[PDB]
Design an enzyme around this catalytic site. Structure first.
Site, PDB file in Angstrom:
ATOM      1  N   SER A   1      -0.569  15.565 -12.010  1.00 19.77           N
ATOM      2  CA  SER A   1      -0.601  15.116 -13.390  1.00 19.77           C
ATOM      3  C   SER A   1      -0.942  16.596 -14.198  1.00 19.77           C
ATOM      4  O   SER A   1      -1.629  17.581 -13.641  1.00 19.77           O
ATOM      5  CB  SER A   1      -2.170  14.281 -13.179  1.00 19.77           C
ATOM      6  OG  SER A   1      -2.456  14.234 -14.861  1.00 19.77           O
TER       7      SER A   1
ATOM      8  N   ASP B   1       0.795  -1.102   0.056  1.00 23.59           N
ATOM      9  CA  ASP B   1       0.018   0.051  -0.066  1.00 23.59           C
ATOM     10  C   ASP B   1       0.953   1.400   0.063  1.00 23.59           C
ATOM     11  O   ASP B   1       1.358   1.652   1.018  1.00 23.59           O
ATOM     12  CB  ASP B   1      -0.994   0.010   1.362  1.00 23.59           C
ATOM     13  CG  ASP B   1      -1.948   1.269   1.252  1.00 23.59           C
ATOM     14  OD1 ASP B   1      -1.997   1.753   0.331  1.00 23.59           O
ATOM     15  OD2 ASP B   1      -2.485   1.295   2.595  1.00 23.59           O
TER      16      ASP B   1
END
Length: 330
Positions: free
Chosen positions: A199, A35
């Site tokens: 992004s 994770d």
């Protein structure tokens, strides 16, 4: 040193991935959920409340000659999906794919929430976010990656998740045969303890690319792709019959639909998520309403590039002094 381990979807929807991890002496092999959105290595154990264990493999520290109680240390964690676990702490030897750390904090669960009990395939979590998020008190502990770092050939690990198929976690090297083209690297902020990046934008299907900054985290421990409501609305508007359902808890679409791809930007590069990756199947057995793999982050507080996005790429988690993230197509 290096390590290399195969990671395998837990079910036919790729809801999560499990990776075998050797703990203790002799080895006890547990299948852990790696994770990159948390920083605790915790396991089902001989100390876990018996009614909260249902088919998981447990770690038994009393059977390990290298286990030592970390006296006084406790932990307690809550995840974004509302699940939680807590317990005490041992140090022991932990190996992943041939890479061995001695003195790793292994957090033994005394309590786990229902979601964990009900998932027989996950024996615990191995956190790969920054150690500043580790919940051990009063002495915060280091992640497996942080402990391994100095011994690694290169201070990196890579995630190569499969679509309905096994993939690979590598530690300490970049497998140049595992991706196509070049790797585009992008800056990371560690201010919140995550692999947080920006992004450069998105496209829906064959539509034009929208240049826009989207701050989010690279999180292997989250199934879906969670983005701003504007972006997600623009995606699902291209699917006839798709709608956000308050009763179901997100966007659903007719199972008869063909889904468009979704592209996200990494610098000047582009990662394309095929439409099939965004189909998470009937909301209930036999339903003709299917659950979407792109959902709104509104009310999470953060955008999350989960497995839906990450499995479309070869992803480099660069833990050099100045950390970065790399993405390549594959």
């Amino acid at each position: 040193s290096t390590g290399s381990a195969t990671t395998t979807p837990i079910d036919s929807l790729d809801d999560a991935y499990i990776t075998p991890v050797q703990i203790g002496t002799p080895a006890q092999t547990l299948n852990l959920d790696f994770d990159t959105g948390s920083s605790d290595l915790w396991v089902f154990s001989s100390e876990t409340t018996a009614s909260e264990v249902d088919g998981q493999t447990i770690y038994t520290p009393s059977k390990s000659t290298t286990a030592k109680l970390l006296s006084g240390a406790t932990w307690s964690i809550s995840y974004g999906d509302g699940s939680s676990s807590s317990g005490d702490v041992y140090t022991d030897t932990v190996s992943v794919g041939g890479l061995t750390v001695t003195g790793q904090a292994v957090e033994s669960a005394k309590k786990v929430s229902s979601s964990f009990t009900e998932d027989s395939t996950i024996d615990g979590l191995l956190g790969l976010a920054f150690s500043t998020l580790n919940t051990v008190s009063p002495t915060q502990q280091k992640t497996f990656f942080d402990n391994a770092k100095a011994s690694l050939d290169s201070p990196v690990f890579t995630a190569d998740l499969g679509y309905h198929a096994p993939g690979t976690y590598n530690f300490g090297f970049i497998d140049t045969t595992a991706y196509t083209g070049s790797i585009t690297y992008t800056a990371v902020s560690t201010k919140q303890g995550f692999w947080e990046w920006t992004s450069t934008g998105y496209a829906v299907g064959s539509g034009t690319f929208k240049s826009t900054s989207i701050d989010g985290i690279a999180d292997t421990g989250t199934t879906l792709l969670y983005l701003p409501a504007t972006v997600v609305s623009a995606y699902w508007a291209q699917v006839s019959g798709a709608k956000s359902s308050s009763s179901v808890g997100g966007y659903v679409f007719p199972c008869s639909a063909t889904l468009p791809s979704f592209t996200f930007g990494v610098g000047s590069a582009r990662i394309v998520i095929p439409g099939d990756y965004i189909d998470f199947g009937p909301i209930s057995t036999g339903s003709s309403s299917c659950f979407g793999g792109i959902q709104s982050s509104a009310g999470i507080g953060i955008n999350i590039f989960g497995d839906v996005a990450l499995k479309a790429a070869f992803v480099v988690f660069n833990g050099a002094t100045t950390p970065t993230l790399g993405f390549a197509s594959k």
